[PDB]
Structure 1
Amino acid sequence: KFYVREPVNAKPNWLAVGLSVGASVFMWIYLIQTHNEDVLEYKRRNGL
C-alpha cells in the first residue's frame, strides 16, 4: 500500500522458508543421531 513500486520482498518466499526450516530440523536430528551412534560405537570398541 505504501511503496509505489511494490517491494521485491513483499511476502516471504514460502518455499525458501519451508526448505530452510526443514534443513535445520534435519541437520539437528541427524547430528543428534550421529552423536549417539558415535558414542555407542566408541564404548563398544573400547569395552565401555
Structure 2
Amino acid sequence: KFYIQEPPHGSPNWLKVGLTLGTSVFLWIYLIKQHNEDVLEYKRRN
C-alpha cells in the first residue's frame, strides 16, 4: 500500500520530535538540582 496520496505525518519530524525528547532532559536535571539544594538548606537550618 505504502500510504497513497501523501500521508499527513511521515513519522520522523526531528524538528518537533527532537525538541520534545530534549525538554524532558531539561526538566530532569532542573528537578534533582533543587532536590539536592532543599536537603542542603534543611541540614543548614536544622
TM bucket, shorter chain: 0.7 to 0.9
> For residue 9 of structure 2, what is the aligned residue in structure 1?
9
Structure with the bigger RCO (C-alpha within 8 Å, sep 6+) is: 1
Matched letter for residue 6 of structure 2 = E
- Show structure 1 runs of 4+ deviating over 3 A: none
Identity of aligned residues (%): 72
User: How far did residue 19 of structure 1 move?
Assistant: 1.1
TM-score, normalised with respect to structure 2: 0.80
Which amino acid in the other structure matches residue 31 of structure 2? Answer: L
Higher share of residues assigned helix: 1
Q: What number of residue pairs does the alignment pair up?
A: 46
Q: TM-score, normalised by structure 1?
A: 0.78
In the alignment, structure 2 segments of 5+ residues that lack a partner are none
